[PDB]
Amino acid sequence: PNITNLCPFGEVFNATRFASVYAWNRKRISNCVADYSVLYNSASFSTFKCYGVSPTKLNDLCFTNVYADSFVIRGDEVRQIAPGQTGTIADYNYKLPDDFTGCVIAWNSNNLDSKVGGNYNYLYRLFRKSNLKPFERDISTEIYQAGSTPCNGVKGFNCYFPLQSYGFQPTYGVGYQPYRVVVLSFELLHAPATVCGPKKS
Amino acid sequence: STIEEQAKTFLDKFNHEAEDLFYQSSLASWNYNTNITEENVQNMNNAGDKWSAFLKEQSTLAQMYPLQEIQNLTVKLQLQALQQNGSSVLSEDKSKRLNTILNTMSTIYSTGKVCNPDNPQECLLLEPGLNEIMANSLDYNERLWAWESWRSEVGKQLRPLYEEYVVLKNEMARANHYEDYGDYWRGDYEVNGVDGYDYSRGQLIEDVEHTFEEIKPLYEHLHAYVRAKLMNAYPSYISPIGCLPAHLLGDMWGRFWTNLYSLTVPFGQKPNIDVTDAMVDQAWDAQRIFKEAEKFFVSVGLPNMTQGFWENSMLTDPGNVQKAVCHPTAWDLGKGDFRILMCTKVTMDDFLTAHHEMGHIQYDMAYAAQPFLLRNGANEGFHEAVGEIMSLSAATPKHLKSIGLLSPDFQEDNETEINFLLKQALTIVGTLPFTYMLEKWRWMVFKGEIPKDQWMKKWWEMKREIVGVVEPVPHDETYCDPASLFHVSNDYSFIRYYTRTLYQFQFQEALCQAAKHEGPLHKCDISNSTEAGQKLFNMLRLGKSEPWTLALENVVGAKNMNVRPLLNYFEPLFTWLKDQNKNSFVGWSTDWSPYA
Ligand SMILES: *[C@@H]1O[C@H](CO)[C@@H](O[C@@H]2O[C@H](CO)[C@@H](O)[C@H](O)[C@H]2NC(C)=O)[C@H](O)[C@H]1NC(C)=O
Ligand SMILES: *[C@@H]1O[C@H](CO)[C@@H](O[C@@H]2O[C@H](CO)[C@@H](O)[C@H](O)[C@H]2NC(C)=O)[C@H](O)[C@H]1NC(C)=O
Ligand SMILES: *[C@@H]1O[C@H](CO)[C@@H](O[C@@H]2O[C@H](CO)[C@@H](O)[C@H](O)[C@H]2NC(C)=O)[C@H](O)[C@H]1NC(C)=O
Ligand SMILES: *[C@@H]1O[C@H](CO)[C@@H](O[C@@H]2O[C@H](CO)[C@@H](O)[C@H](O)[C@H]2NC(C)=O)[C@H](O)[C@H]1NC(C)=O
Ligand SMILES: *[C@@H]1O[C@H](CO)[C@@H](O[C@@H]2O[C@H](CO)[C@@H](O)[C@H](O)[C@H]2NC(C)=O)[C@H](O)[C@H]1NC(C)=O
Ligand SMILES: *[C@@H]1O[C@H](CO)[C@@H](O)[C@H](O)[C@H]1NC(C)=O
Ligand SMILES: *[C@@H]1O[C@H](CO)[C@@H](O)[C@H](O)[C@H]1NC(C)=O
Ligand SMILES: *[C@@H]1O[C@H](CO)[C@@H](O)[C@H](O)[C@H]1NC(C)=O
């Protein structure tokens, strides 16, 4: 029949505001029809990389549900969103498994997130005892203890606040300007498939 | 507990705050400089001091990690810079007195006023005016009058202040485990890391005159030729056997001999290379100059300028009430922000200055990947030398003819080459003895070798011995002539300008050798040469991470600092001067004085 009940990609890629990287926003897409042709043919995306499957064949195969993870990161920090990568983001904020299948889209948003006086509403974690397992979120704000002296929830000689804020401004050069990132991860649990592409007529 | 692993976290925490605080301070400074107004002043200060306050607190933390247990060379080097106490080692009473004395010296230096006796109601300043009196004029009495007035009405009150300043700064330096204040200034030319690249503070002193005795044969012939020309210009005023007076050089202090080119031109009929008329005829605006400058670095192989430099930077025309300072500067605000500040006009000098500033910007962009505390040159002589290389390589007739700025049928011969080489020699090689003498005198007075009474008599008796300049009028002890200079009362080191000149020519010769060029060195060009662009880029990107001894190994063959290329650059000039002053005396005798 006619293509109907389209998945709500509008409310994900055209949201008013995005969450911070240490608290990336996860949305579940199921029981609808997805059109990746408009996403692929759009020229607004600076980075569009698909690892598990070829982008041209997306409309053919279809899975049971999709997860969209949205956040905002730096410019040169985009390359860390890839399997088998190391860094401050890939170890403390967002980790992808080596067998990851899906796609990553990233586009510049310097005209929205940046503010002349400095936008301090975006935060990221800088210190943590251990690395993150794939697809794990941590929102704790407990004081990190680098040394051996205990801290009673107060910063000091060897105790630091884990979270640090970005300083986005319009005059920042390329590689420091804000970039909005959406990661699509497809799950293939043995339940009947629901998220399937449109049948061309 | 461990100290090596828990210092990396402290450094990482420090860098995050330092980057954005420094960016805000630099942005405020740029906003003030571009738009001079009352409102944009306090804000700048409201950032500045705050930034300084930060560098206080972190320093107090840096002392808590001992430096005898860190094994990583990079971490130890980065932490060593933060561990310096600075001037915060003395008591508050002495520190405030030092700050007050520095401020009052700086204010007194920039408030010069001298009125001539006949009309005591008109004084002049160091700005154009009194400076112009002995910059472009042919007279003996007025130049001497201006010299004596400036050195007896501005330099006679700095002596009591400098006398206490020297001892106070020496005590401050001794409180930091340095034997004197000389080692504090020489500490930047010191590395104690990689074996075989070791350098010491005291080695530079022995290394300065060892590379200076090879220049005396070249300097003596230039001195003799200049003296002969001055005799031909000024009759019965300069003895042929002796040397030349002090106020006839062409500047306030004789730092440069450029103003003397008009009197001592080799050939008068042959004109110089001037393309300003061609610049105007072809209608070259200010954007074209910077586009041509960009084309040079693109052709060499260096990366292209980022978009945003053409947008944020104030390239030209302050124009209306939107006032600005016209001092050409290159700004690295951080976070990938590079800008330029210039009042560009249609002149070859502006072309060369644009090339110079573009080279500075390229060097700043080279080491952007280093940590915050390592985003600087290896020493103070590399940055300006890299800046001057581009100016050196962009003035050759071949480059001008290639860009369609000179007639293709140009017929350069002996005369123009000799004229241009002499013009460059009057500026480059004519300033080394002055810098060497000044730095030697400052080091000796800081070390305490010369007592208080032996201040004004050693200075002149080494000026006559090294430079060959006599005092027009006897100066007793109560004068403080050396303090009458910009980099003597503002607490600035002066040895940078000596090593920079040698580094410039070493780099130029190395590039010309690794550019497949045959012929004299003064006609060499590094344009269109990709292989010459990589060799430079291997040392630009190191920054302060590696010792400067290793930095002088990816460009030149040897790690030492020897003046080989200068003696080869002015080879035709030397061989012409050998046959020119044949019927004259080469040398000076320190017995003849103008007053007696
Ligand atoms: C977000 O909204 C914009 C609306 O401006 C969508 O842009 C579409 O594609 C082009 C872009 O100018 C135009 O035809 C229209 O503006 C939009 N509609 C159509 C039918 O093309 C953009 O696709 C939206 N983002 C999504 C859906 O992810
Ligand atoms: C000092 O510490 C730095 C920072 O860790 C080390 O630099 C790293 O060296 C490894 C060696 O392969 C590289 O893979 C990394 O890319 C380097 N940078 C970083 C940020 O890790 C340096 O090797 C250490 N020096 C020593 C141990 O002598
Ligand atoms: C910088 O100043 C600090 C503060 O005085 C100096 O630290 C002192 O060093 C002496 C000699 O080792 C000790 O006896 C004191 O106990 C230290 N004081 C403190 C508060 O630690 C330091 O030596 C100075 N010089 C540096 C850091 O190079
Ligand atoms: C810097 O110069 C390089 C080399 O010219 C530019 O790279 C290409 O330049 C040509 C001609 O200008 C363009 O047609 C290409 O589109 C450029 N390629 C790319 C990937 O940009 C480069 O664009 C220049 N950079 C800037 C900021 O002007
Ligand atoms: C090497 O230098 C020559 C000399 O200018 C360059 O040749 C010019 O090339 C432009 C087009 O690129 C022509 O319009 C000029 O007529 C050429 N001039 C001459 C004298 O032939 C050449 O482009 C340079 N090579 C590189 C790689 O930049
Ligand atoms: C599909 O669209 C066509 C054209 O608008 C229409 O005639 C047809 O009834 C539609 N099919 C359904 C099932 O609504
Ligand atoms: C310069 O500063 C004045 C006063 O602060 C202000 O009125 C003016 O708009 C500024 N100009 C620019 C270009 O920022
Ligand atoms: C240049 O110098 C050589 C060497 O003496 C001489 O033979 C030649 O005539 C000179 N040319 C000109 C144009 O002066």
Side-chain angles (χ1 to χ4, degrees), chain B residues 35 37 39-40 322:
Chain B
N35 190 3
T37 180
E39 210 282 326
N40 291 47
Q322 177 49 257

Side-chain angles (χ1 to χ4, degrees), chain B residues 376-428:
Chain B
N376 279 114
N379 46 355
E380 290 82 4
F382 281 175
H383 194 272
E384 199 68 25
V386 164
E388 295 259 3
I389 288 164
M390 311 325 158
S391 297
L392 264 190
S393 175
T396 56
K398 170 195 310 303
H399 181 84
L400 294 179
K401 199 167 73 175
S402 85
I403 64 171
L405 190 61
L406 277 181
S407 66
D409 302 337
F410 197 71
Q411 297 300 108
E412 68 271 29
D413 55 356
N414 300 320
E415 323 289 322
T416 186
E417 295 299 327
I418 291 171
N419 288 316
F420 155 74
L421 207 57
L422 185 134
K423 165 177 263 309
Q424 271 195 323
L426 283 172
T427 311
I428 289 174

